[PDB]
């Protein structure tokens, strides 16, 4: 049972683009987003659906009220490539990855 469906599965983007990842929940828990560089420990990115976590620049943003949540990453830095994970405390999704175009 997956009640956090990240979509699209992956994105291939050049540096400086604006990446968008949608995640769909169906329960009142709330969202957070992880990310780990290849071979590195994960880091919290977005918290509470829209709030940037500590040490996270304004590039990353989140929304919205409802079951669908739209992660967004403006000005794609190459260091931000790798796997992202949708999350809300008791949930996480399948994970999705961003790579070079």
């Amino acid at each position: 049972e997956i009640v956090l469906t990240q979509s699209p599965g992956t994105l291939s983007l050049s540096p400086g683009e604006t990446a968008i990842i949608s995640c769909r929940t169906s329960q009142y828990g709330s969202l957070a987003w992880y990310q780990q560089r290849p071979g590195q420990a994960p880091r919290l990115v977005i918290y509470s659906g829209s709030t940037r976590a500590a040490g996270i620049p304004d590039r990353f943003s989140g929304s919205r009220w409802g079951p669908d949540y739209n992660l967004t990453i403006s000005n794609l830095e190459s260091g931000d490539f790798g796997v992202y994970y949708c999350q809300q405390y008791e949930f996480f999704g399948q994970g999705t990855k961003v790579q070079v175009d």
Partner: protein, 121 residues
């Protein structure tokens, strides 16, 4: 600085006992609720283990009943994860973790070195 230090990994035969230790470096280990999760290539993550090290409260996932056990020593400030009856599917990196604040007992702040588990089939 608060930090989670993981011991070395394992590569042993399947159908074996597998053990890991993690220390909450630079922190009052007794107070905060640690957690264990799995990360593997191309797989969903999976939450493994709860530990409220004050009383030693424990609970764990549906696929892990019986097989998986964990404990702690408050004096050593070290949590211990031990899996029984190792199998090929157990191959994954394991992280001892923590939340942003020790109020929500979920793993969304800290991550160790990701000590790996490998099954020599």
């Amino acid at each position: 600085q608060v930090q989670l230090v993981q011991s070395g990994g394992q590569m042993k035969k399947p159908g074996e006992s597998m053990r890991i230790s993690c220390r909450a470096s630079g922190y009052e280990f007794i107070d905060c609720t640690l957690n264990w999760i799995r990360l593997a290539p191309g797989k969903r993550p999976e939450w493994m283990g709860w530990l409220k090290p004050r009383g030693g409260a424990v609970n764990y996932a549906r696929p892990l009943q019986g097989r998986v056990t964990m404990t702690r020593d408050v004096y050593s400030d070290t949590a211990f994860l031990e899996l029984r009856s190792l199998t090929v599917d157990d191959t994954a990196v394991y992280f001892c973790t923590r939340g942003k604040n020790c109020d929500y007992n979920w793993d969304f702040e800290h991550w160790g070195r990701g000590t790996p588990v490998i099954v020599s089939s």
